Amino acid sequence: WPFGPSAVEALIETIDRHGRVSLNDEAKMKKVVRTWKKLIERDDLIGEIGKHYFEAPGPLHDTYDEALATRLVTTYSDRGVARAILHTRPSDPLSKKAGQAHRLEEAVASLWKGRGYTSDNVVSSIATGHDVDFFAPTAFTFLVKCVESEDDANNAIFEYFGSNPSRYFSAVLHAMEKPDADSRVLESSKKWMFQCYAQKQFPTPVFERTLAAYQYEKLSLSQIEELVEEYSRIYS
Numbered sequence: 001w002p003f004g005p006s007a008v009e010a011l012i013e014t015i016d017r018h019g020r021v022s023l024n025d026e027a028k029m030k031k032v033v034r035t036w037k038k039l040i041e042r043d044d045l046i047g048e049i050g051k052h053y054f055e056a057p058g059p060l061h062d063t064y065d066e067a068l069a070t071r072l073v074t075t076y077s078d079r080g081v082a083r084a085i086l087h088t089r090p091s092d093p094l095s096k097k098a099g100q101a102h103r104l105e106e107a108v109a110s111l112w113k114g115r116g117y118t119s120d121n122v123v124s125s126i127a128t129g130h131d132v133d134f135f136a137p138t139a140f141t142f143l144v145k146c147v148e149s150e151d152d153a154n155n156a157i158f159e160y161f162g163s164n165p166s167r168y169f170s171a172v173l174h175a176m177e178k179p180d181a182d183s184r185v186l187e188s189s190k191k192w193m194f195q196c197y198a199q200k201q202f203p204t205p206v207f208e209r210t211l212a213a214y215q216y217e218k219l220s221l222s223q224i225e226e227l228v229e230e231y232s233r234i235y236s
Helices: 007-020 025-041 046-055 065-088 098-115 119-126 137-147 150-160 165-177 183-199 204-213 221-234
Strands: none
Touching (some): 007 025, 007 046, 065 098, 098 119, 150 165, 165 183, 165 204, 183 221
């Protein structure tokens, strides 16, 4: 504390030093020989140093994140933790807190995947009660960490919406109106729905009829016409 290190502590500080200044072949070859000599010269080092790295392999390790998530999910429910993840996400990209937050949310995503959750379980956990909230950046980001892509995220929202293109579009647009919207990602979700219909080869007239038939606040006559026009001009 104010005093000398144990043999174990001292050797650990050496190995760390060597791994932090990183570097250089000729230096490596000599330093590793020296370290080896120290490890073998007595019989009470290998076990303890091994255990030390086992419990903490390096400065980027996240060894116990799953246990933490298990504790938290168990204590505060899937909905509790979804809410906390969505709400405490720092808005500042340079936030000192973003790392911690990414660890927590990534730990929850992994835990859920490993328990066998579906896309639907994830969206359901995220659900606030307002469709538009799915496309809010803080929510959409988490969702993407859970289902691994924008394609799967959009698709999961669509399916959670009973696969209703009108509900989906309404949500995307309303979202676009929102104050901190990420218009590029929203543009991408919109494009995604259109592309779903194109891929399945819908004629524009059938697209229009589909939008109408599926009628959560609905789409305006002008909205339906605008969507149909886009479909017609862009996605054949």
